[PDB]
């Protein structure tokens, strides 16, 4: 099945890729690997080609690499980025060293959209709907994105949206601004609704044009958050695992939850009502993606027969204890077994 490869050095990084990919132009990015925009002559579409930043440096990196690949190969949903292709110029396992992932090619992200025009309440409806539709699918596979924010959301001319860059790390500022407090402060073993918290922060911002919790640091942010949603009640406190975390919380002057209708004056009442449900401090009380889709706010888009769940996602690999080479060989097998999407 092997295609013909051609190598070239760009921004002084050697890129050896199949000839189907042409006109590679460096579209940047740090320590996770570098990425080039390119023309996919097989599909006639534009794509992003990422050369992986030393995937097998250590056991930890070999495993991160395996985790990303497994994740990307499984994601098949209109609102989530999938793997268009994956390859290595390597001819055998023995010489396997570089890994390339081909996908999307993000025209603009949500921020870019907000920058070039004023969104109407209809735009916000459709956009958040798609985020939740994509989230429903993700969550149904016991997957937590963990890092939703405007920059990780691609949007096109027809307002179609896809979720990108899943947080994959077994571990002032933007990312923290859309994070649920329990994660940000390491309060407990958190659940899928942390993503719902992010959606809340995103939607609020889209409606008012202002970031919701732009704290300069973890404490400043917690204070902005607690100001809106009130302080932790006893029910939540018993759920907070860290003894210090609870102690700190009990040092805080209690605060009642605010009335969101007073915070978001002039926005669709259905929207304000959905925010109320998403921005709940107790993760066990937040609305889920599936539930959010059936909320009155999305009446004009909701379609229960067109909001698919995902196939079973096996993550038992997370508990395996293997050598760098076993994670490497495992990764290789995943590259070899990759099947391209239709047409």
């Amino acid at each position: 099945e092997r295609p013909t490869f051609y190598r070239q050095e760009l921004n002084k990084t050697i890129w050896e890729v199949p000839e189907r990919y042409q006109n590679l132009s460096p579209v940047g990015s740090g320590a996770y690997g570098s990425v080039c925009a390119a023309f996919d002559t097989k599909t006639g579409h534009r794509v992003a080609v990422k050369k992986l930043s030393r995937p097998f440096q250590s056991i930890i990196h070999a495993k991160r690499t395996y985790r990303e690949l497994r994740l990307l190969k499984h994601m098949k949903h209109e609102n989530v980025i999938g793997l268009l292709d994956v390859f290595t110029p390597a001819r055998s396992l023995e010489e396997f060293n570089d890994v390339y992932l081909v996908t999307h090619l993000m025209g603009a992200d949500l921020n870019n959209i907000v920058k070039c025009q004023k969104l109407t309440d209809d735009h916000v409806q459709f956009l958040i709907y798609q985020i939740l539709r994509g989230l429903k699918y993700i969550h149904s596979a016991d997957i937590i994105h963990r890092d939703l924010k405007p920059s990780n959301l691609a949007v096109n001319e027809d307002c179609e949206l896809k979720i990108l860059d899943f947080g994959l790390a077994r571990h002032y500022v933007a990312t923290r601004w859309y994070r649920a407090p329990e994660i940000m402060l390491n309060w407990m073993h958190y659940n899928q609704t942390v993503d719902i918290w992010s959606v809340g922060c995103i939607m609020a911002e889209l409606l008012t044009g202002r970031t919701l919790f732009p704290g300069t640091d973890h404490i400043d942010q917690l204070k902005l958050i607690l100001r809106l949603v009130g302080t932790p009640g006893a029910e939540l406190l018993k759920k907070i695992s860290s003894e210090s975390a609870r102690n700190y919380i009990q040092s805080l002057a209690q605060m009642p939850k605010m009335n969101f209708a007073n915070v978001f004056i002039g926005a669709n009442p259905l929207a304000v009502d959905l925010l109320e449900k998403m921005l709940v401090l107790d993760s066990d009380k937040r609305i889920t993606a599936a539930q959010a889709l059936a909320h009155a706010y999305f009446a004009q888009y909701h379609d229960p027969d067109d909001e698919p769940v995902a196939d079973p996602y096996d993550q038992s690999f997370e508990s395996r204890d293997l050598l760098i080479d076993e994670w490497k060989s495992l990764t290789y097998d995943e590259v070899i077994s990759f099947v391209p999407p239709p047409l």
């Binding site: 025209g107 603009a108 959209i113 920058k115 070039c116 735009h123 409806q125 001319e157 027809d158």
Partner: peptide, 8 residues
């Protein structure tokens, strides 16, 4: 929904 321009 609709017609976004995507670059500024």
């Amino acid at each position: 929904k609709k017609d976004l321009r995507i670059s500024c």
